[PDB]
Amino acid sequence: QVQLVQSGAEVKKPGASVKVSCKASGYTFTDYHINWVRQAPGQGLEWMGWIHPNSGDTNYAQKFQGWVTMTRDTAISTAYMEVNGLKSDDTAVYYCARAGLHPTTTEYYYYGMDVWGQGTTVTVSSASFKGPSVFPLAPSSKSTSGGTAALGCLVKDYFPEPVTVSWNSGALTSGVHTFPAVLQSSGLYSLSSVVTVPSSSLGTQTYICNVNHKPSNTKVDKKVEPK
């Protein structure tokens, strides 16, 4: 079938360049335009331009002309998108797409996109492999049911995923809520884990979050006191 096979995920430091590839299969490469579209996390589709593999002709979008370069290698049926001077706002999924929707009239002489690649993730960050800092989220009962309190642990600024959190070495599982990590402009991750416990137990029972970040070989057992 008609497929576009895109290269793998990339982590780039600011200022670097990145060149992602888009290899065609299941059809003749020089028969259709290749369009490029990028999508920042949680945003919409953003057309970057197209290249015709037969002639090499390009049409750069206004927002991207001058700092991206579309090329192609017909010998190996591959198109390339190079992005230069990478900034944090260049973090996105970069799609290629075949322009298989031929025009129906000479009035609207446009070849539209039919088959899309799976996308190439590019994350621009000053991030290196980094263990997290763990801070306590001291108990409060303002948003929990009557007679219960919520306390937690802030696991801040780590890379890469994942971070696992347990409570009291696994003895405490009921009422534990570990929220999925946020990915920040720095390219570092942060997550929080909170457990809802009886208010009376705050004087009696000790609460420890067991944070494990294997990629940096960091472990923290943070005791969370009522303060």
Place this chain on the structure above:
Amino acid sequence: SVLTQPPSVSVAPGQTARITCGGNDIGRKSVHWNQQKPGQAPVLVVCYDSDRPSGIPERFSGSNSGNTATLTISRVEAGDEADYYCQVWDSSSDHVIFGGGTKLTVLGQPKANPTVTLFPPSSEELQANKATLVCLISDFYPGAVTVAWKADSSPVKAGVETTTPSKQSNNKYAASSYLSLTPEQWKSHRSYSCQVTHEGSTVEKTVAPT
């Protein structure tokens, strides 16, 4: 040239969803429609205003005339929940233009209001010359939410990072939002607030230094 789409449309299963794509003289252009699900690449569901591509159910129908193109999805199923994009070529600029995208929500359970928990920066973090406010949001449906931060009754958008909603074990949604401050910023204002808007209602929590 700009294509205007409503940011969101919500329907119950079996109902008919209608997604509009507004543009001047868009009836003269040929509109294609893309469907994108999370963990999906854009897929063609309508081509050439109204044509149905291969494999797409006949429930997916498009129309185009005047200043508005419309994607119509009859007998909506839960699998139709996705972001939909209209696309057009603008000859005067030689640009391919996508609409802003419409998130189609298929309402599979009653609305549930969010629970908001807000933690102030810890004293230990302040001693490390940092300050992070943690806003935790849970138990809401549908899984669409917008967070806004304020300080002394004034909007704050620098340093805000919000996750997208994620399903919980009880099949409701959860999310979190972080506000990174300096120790002086945290200590100089009255208070900061996390404002969570969900389905036209807002829940706001506020914390203050010491």
